[PDB]
């Protein structure tokens, strides 16, 4: 029954993949409330989000960039420390939550790889002029204002690069 949702260049996204983010989110995943305009109205944005995800995965594969297991270990430890919940007990919880441990490993791996790829390819297209930093510091300092500058510049550059890839990639909806 699992069809193919769409095609992305040399890869595809399939229906069970969006399933892992439609019935596994929005009254699932975490903070069940989230947003309820409608799921039928939300079908469009989840599809566009996942196809963008697949595009970034293809990109990161093209640069030959990989993540080893130790980084995943530190990442899952950090997830444990922010969740204030022990790792093995989270495994036992996700056993009944509907999230398999191996599927969890795969999704954490791809989330890490997409995050690091977007970071690495955005901070090249972000410039800093050592003049606006002084003026912004005088507005309100000592590399602190640079954090806000970085956050804002990333905020625009992320969407810019996402639409850049989206326009210049083969996409077509199948189901």
């Amino acid at each position: 029954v699992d069809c193919v949702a769409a095609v992305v260049n040399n890869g595809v996204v399939l229906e069970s993949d969006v399933d892992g983010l439609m019935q596994s989110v929005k009254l699932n995943a975490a903070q069940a409330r989230q947003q309820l305009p409608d799921d039928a109205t939300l079908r469009h944005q989840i599809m566009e989000r996942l196809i963008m995800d697949q595009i970034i995965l293809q990109m990161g594969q093209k640069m030959g960039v990989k993540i080893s297991d130790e980084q995943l270990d530190q990442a899952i430890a950090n997830i444990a420390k922010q969740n204030n919940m022990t790792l093995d007990q989270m495994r036992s919880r996700l056993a009944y939550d509907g999230l398999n441990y191996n599927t969890y490993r795969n999704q954490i791996r791809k989330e890490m790889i997409i995050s690091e790829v977007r970071n690495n390819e955005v901070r090249r297209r972000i410039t800093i002029l050592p003049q606006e930093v002084e003026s912004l510091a005088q507005q309100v300092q000592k590399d602190r204002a640079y954090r806000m500058l970085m956050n804002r510049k990333f905020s625009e550059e992320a969407a810019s690069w996402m639409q850049e890839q989206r326009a210049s990639a083969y996409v077509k909806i199948l189901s």
């Binding site: 989110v25 989230q34 947003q35 890490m112």
Partner: peptide, 8 residues
Amino acid sequence: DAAQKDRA
């Protein structure tokens, strides 16, 4: 953003 647990 909707989900709480996300990429670290």
